[PDB]
PDB file of all heavy atoms in Angstrom:
ATOM      1  N   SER B  39       7.941  14.653  13.238  1.00 28.19           N
ATOM      2  CA  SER B  39       6.776  15.345  13.518  1.00 28.19           C
ATOM      3  C   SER B  39       5.583  14.460  14.127  1.00 28.19           C
ATOM      4  O   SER B  39       5.118  14.779  15.100  1.00 28.19           O
ATOM      5  CB  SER B  39       6.158  15.975  12.155  1.00 28.19           C
ATOM      6  OG  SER B  39       7.281  16.833  11.619  1.00 28.19           O
ATOM      7  N   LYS B  40       5.347  13.426  13.435  1.00 27.16           N
ATOM      8  CA  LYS B  40       4.308  12.514  13.826  1.00 27.16           C
ATOM      9  C   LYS B  40       4.761  11.119  14.285  1.00 27.16           C
ATOM     10  O   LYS B  40       5.812  10.640  13.651  1.00 27.16           O
ATOM     11  CB  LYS B  40       3.248  12.289  12.747  1.00 27.16           C
ATOM     12  CG  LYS B  40       2.619  13.494  12.321  1.00 27.16           C
ATOM     13  CD  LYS B  40       1.307  13.179  11.485  1.00 27.16           C
ATOM     14  CE  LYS B  40       1.526  12.643   9.990  1.00 27.16           C
ATOM     15  NZ  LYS B  40       2.187  13.465   9.154  1.00 27.16           N
ATOM     16  N   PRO B  41       4.329  10.568  15.461  1.00 26.27           N
ATOM     17  CA  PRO B  41       4.830   9.307  15.853  1.00 26.27           C
ATOM     18  C   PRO B  41       4.416   8.289  14.809  1.00 26.27           C
ATOM     19  O   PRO B  41       3.379   8.416  14.340  1.00 26.27           O
ATOM     20  CB  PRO B  41       4.102   9.186  17.221  1.00 26.27           C
ATOM     21  CG  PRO B  41       2.748   9.805  16.988  1.00 26.27           C
ATOM     22  CD  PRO B  41       3.234  11.066  16.229  1.00 26.27           C
ATOM     23  N   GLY B  42       5.144   7.288  14.650  1.00 25.71           N
ATOM     24  CA  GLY B  42       4.812   6.232  13.608  1.00 25.71           C
ATOM     25  C   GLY B  42       5.698   5.022  13.536  1.00 25.71           C
ATOM     26  O   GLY B  42       6.731   4.912  14.257  1.00 25.71           O
ATOM     27  N   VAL B  43       5.381   4.081  12.727  1.00 25.44           N
ATOM     28  CA  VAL B  43       6.052   2.842  12.565  1.00 25.44           C
ATOM     29  C   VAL B  43       6.039   2.533  11.057  1.00 25.44           C
ATOM     30  O   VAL B  43       5.128   3.014  10.350  1.00 25.44           O
ATOM     31  CB  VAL B  43       5.472   1.679  13.362  1.00 25.44           C
ATOM     32  CG1 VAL B  43       5.319   2.042  14.794  1.00 25.44           C
ATOM     33  CG2 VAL B  43       4.142   1.383  12.720  1.00 25.44           C
ATOM     34  N   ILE B  44       7.015   1.823  10.633  1.00 21.58           N
ATOM     35  CA  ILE B  44       7.033   1.445   9.220  1.00 21.58           C
ATOM     36  C   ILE B  44       7.046   0.047   9.096  1.00 21.58           C
ATOM     37  O   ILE B  44       7.792  -0.867   9.589  1.00 21.58           O
ATOM     38  CB  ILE B  44       8.406   2.006   8.592  1.00 21.58           C
ATOM     39  CG1 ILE B  44       8.612   3.444   8.846  1.00 21.58           C
ATOM     40  CG2 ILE B  44       8.534   1.508   7.215  1.00 21.58           C
ATOM     41  CD1 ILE B  44       9.894   4.098   8.581  1.00 21.58           C
ATOM     42  N   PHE B  45       6.077  -0.541   8.284  1.00 17.67           N
ATOM     43  CA  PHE B  45       5.901  -1.985   8.015  1.00 17.67           C
ATOM     44  C   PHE B  45       6.542  -2.320   6.873  1.00 17.67           C
ATOM     45  O   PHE B  45       6.451  -1.542   5.813  1.00 17.67           O
ATOM     46  CB  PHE B  45       4.488  -2.340   8.038  1.00 17.67           C
ATOM     47  CG  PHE B  45       3.722  -2.271   9.371  1.00 17.67           C
ATOM     48  CD1 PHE B  45       2.786  -1.215   9.721  1.00 17.67           C
ATOM     49  CD2 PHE B  45       4.104  -3.037  10.361  1.00 17.67           C
ATOM     50  CE1 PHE B  45       2.182  -1.166  10.904  1.00 17.67           C
ATOM     51  CE2 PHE B  45       3.358  -3.092  11.646  1.00 17.67           C
ATOM     52  CZ  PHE B  45       2.524  -2.098  11.941  1.00 17.67           C
ATOM     53  N   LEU B  46       7.296  -3.401   6.795  1.00 18.04           N
ATOM     54  CA  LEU B  46       7.867  -3.933   5.549  1.00 18.04           C
ATOM     55  C   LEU B  46       6.962  -5.150   5.077  1.00 18.04           C
ATOM     56  O   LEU B  46       6.860  -5.941   5.841  1.00 18.04           O
ATOM     57  CB  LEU B  46       9.168  -4.432   5.756  1.00 18.04           C
ATOM     58  CG  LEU B  46       9.910  -5.184   4.693  1.00 18.04           C
ATOM     59  CD1 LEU B  46      10.065  -4.114   3.414  1.00 18.04           C
ATOM     60  CD2 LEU B  46      11.326  -5.779   5.137  1.00 18.04           C
ATOM     61  N   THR B  47       6.367  -4.991   3.751  1.00 18.80           N
ATOM     62  CA  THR B  47       5.547  -6.058   3.368  1.00 18.80           C
ATOM     63  C   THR B  47       6.465  -7.234   2.775  1.00 18.80           C
ATOM     64  O   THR B  47       7.743  -6.989   2.648  1.00 18.80           O
ATOM     65  CB  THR B  47       4.785  -5.517   2.108  1.00 18.80           C
ATOM     66  OG1 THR B  47       5.637  -5.427   1.009  1.00 18.80           O
ATOM     67  CG2 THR B  47       4.105  -4.243   2.369  1.00 18.80           C
ATOM     68  N   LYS B  48       5.796  -8.373   2.616  1.00 19.75           N
ATOM     69  CA  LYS B  48       6.535  -9.620   2.142  1.00 19.75           C
ATOM     70  C   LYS B  48       7.244  -9.222   0.800  1.00 19.75           C
ATOM     71  O   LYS B  48       8.415  -9.582   0.632  1.00 19.75           O
ATOM     72  CB  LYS B  48       5.558 -10.650   1.966  1.00 19.75           C
ATOM     73  CG  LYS B  48       4.975 -11.229   3.223  1.00 19.75           C
ATOM     74  CD  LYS B  48       5.785 -12.350   3.690  1.00 19.75           C
ATOM     75  CE  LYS B  48       5.159 -12.919   4.924  1.00 19.75           C
ATOM     76  NZ  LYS B  48       3.728 -13.578   4.614  1.00 19.75           N
ATOM     77  N   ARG B  49       6.628  -8.404  -0.047  1.00 17.14           N
ATOM     78  CA  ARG B  49       7.087  -8.049  -1.365  1.00 17.14           C
ATOM     79  C   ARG B  49       8.197  -7.024  -1.160  1.00 17.14           C
ATOM     80  O   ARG B  49       8.621  -6.488  -2.161  1.00 17.14           O
ATOM     81  CB  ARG B  49       5.983  -7.538  -2.204  1.00 17.14           C
ATOM     82  CG  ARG B  49       5.129  -8.635  -2.743  1.00 17.14           C
ATOM     83  CD  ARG B  49       4.064  -8.178  -3.754  1.00 17.14           C
ATOM     84  NE  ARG B  49       3.077  -7.331  -3.132  1.00 17.14           N
ATOM     85  CZ  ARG B  49       2.094  -6.663  -3.760  1.00 17.14           C
ATOM     86  NH1 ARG B  49       2.007  -6.911  -5.049  1.00 17.14           N
ATOM     87  NH2 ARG B  49       1.357  -5.735  -3.210  1.00 17.14           N
ATOM     88  N   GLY B  50       8.578  -6.647   0.083  1.00 15.72           N
ATOM     89  CA  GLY B  50       9.707  -5.689   0.343  1.00 15.72           C
ATOM     90  C   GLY B  50       9.315  -4.234   0.134  1.00 15.72           C
ATOM     91  O   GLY B  50      10.182  -3.471   0.018  1.00 15.72           O
ATOM     92  N   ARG B  51       8.064  -3.822   0.337  1.00 15.99           N
ATOM     93  CA  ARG B  51       7.631  -2.426   0.346  1.00 15.99           C
ATOM     94  C   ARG B  51       7.528  -2.009   1.780  1.00 15.99           C
ATOM     95  O   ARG B  51       7.362  -2.651   2.683  1.00 15.99           O
ATOM     96  CB  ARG B  51       6.312  -2.276  -0.441  1.00 15.99           C
ATOM     97  N   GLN B  52       7.563  -0.613   1.783  1.00 17.09           N
ATOM     98  CA  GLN B  52       7.595   0.021   3.161  1.00 17.09           C
ATOM     99  C   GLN B  52       6.278   1.014   3.294  1.00 17.09           C
ATOM    100  O   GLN B  52       6.119   1.973   2.656  1.00 17.09           O
ATOM    101  CB  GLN B  52       8.841   0.835   3.315  1.00 17.09           C
ATOM    102  CG  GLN B  52       9.998   0.059   3.506  1.00 17.09           C
ATOM    103  CD  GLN B  52      11.254   0.960   3.499  1.00 17.09           C
ATOM    104  OE1 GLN B  52      11.497   1.955   4.161  1.00 17.09           O
ATOM    105  NE2 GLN B  52      12.273   0.482   2.679  1.00 17.09           N
ATOM    106  N   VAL B  53       5.473   0.491   4.215  1.00 19.69           N
ATOM    107  CA  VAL B  53       4.232   1.219   4.521  1.00 19.69           C
ATOM    108  C   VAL B  53       4.207   1.937   5.819  1.00 19.69           C
ATOM    109  O   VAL B  53       4.539   1.305   6.831  1.00 19.69           O
ATOM    110  CB  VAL B  53       2.942   0.289   4.603  1.00 19.69           C
ATOM    111  CG1 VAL B  53       1.684   0.993   4.649  1.00 19.69           C
ATOM    112  CG2 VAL B  53       2.882  -0.531   3.248  1.00 19.69           C
ATOM    113  N   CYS B  54       3.887   3.248   5.875  1.00 21.68           N
ATOM    114  CA  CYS B  54       3.737   3.943   7.204  1.00 21.68           C
ATOM    115  C   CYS B  54       2.407   3.758   7.824  1.00 21.68           C
ATOM    116  O   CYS B  54       1.460   3.640   7.152  1.00 21.68           O
ATOM    117  CB  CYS B  54       3.996   5.471   6.803  1.00 21.68           C
ATOM    118  SG  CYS B  54       5.641   6.159   7.070  1.00 21.68           S
ATOM    119  N   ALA B  55       2.535   3.759   9.183  1.00 20.89           N
ATOM    120  CA  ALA B  55       1.353   3.498   9.933  1.00 20.89           C
ATOM    121  C   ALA B  55       1.354   4.230  11.193  1.00 20.89           C
ATOM    122  O   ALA B  55       2.433   4.460  11.763  1.00 20.89           O
ATOM    123  CB  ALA B  55       1.193   1.988  10.256  1.00 20.89           C
ATOM    124  N   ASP B  56       0.239   4.529  11.830  1.00 20.97           N
ATOM    125  CA  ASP B  56       0.180   5.260  13.154  1.00 20.97           C
ATOM    126  C   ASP B  56       0.232   4.269  14.219  1.00 20.97           C
ATOM    127  O   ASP B  56      -0.751   3.477  14.456  1.00 20.97           O
ATOM    128  CB  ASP B  56      -1.111   6.023  13.221  1.00 20.97           C
ATOM    129  CG  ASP B  56      -1.189   6.806  14.529  1.00 20.97           C
ATOM    130  OD1 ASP B  56      -0.435   6.585  15.414  1.00 20.97           O
ATOM    131  OD2 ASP B  56      -2.115   7.762  14.564  1.00 20.97           O
ATOM    132  N   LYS B  57       1.111   4.349  15.217  1.00 19.27           N
ATOM    133  CA  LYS B  57       1.403   3.416  16.278  1.00 19.27           C
ATOM    134  C   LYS B  57       0.309   3.806  17.387  1.00 19.27           C
ATOM    135  O   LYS B  57       0.578   3.163  18.475  1.00 19.27           O
ATOM    136  CB  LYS B  57       2.789   3.632  16.772  1.00 19.27           C
ATOM    137  CG  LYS B  57       3.139   4.766  17.940  1.00 19.27           C
ATOM    138  CD  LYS B  57       4.547   4.659  18.401  1.00 19.27           C
ATOM    139  CE  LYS B  57       4.809   5.536  19.599  1.00 19.27           C
ATOM    140  NZ  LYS B  57       4.242   6.908  19.462  1.00 19.27           N
TER     141      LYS B  57
END
Side-chain angles (χ1 to χ4, degrees), chain B residues 39-50 52-57:
Chain B
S39 305
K40 301 200 290 291
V43 301
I44 302 165
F45 289 111
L46 173 62
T47 73
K48 292 270 184 59
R49 291 185 293 179
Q52 293 170 47
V53 184
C54 261
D56 181 348
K57 90 180 191 301

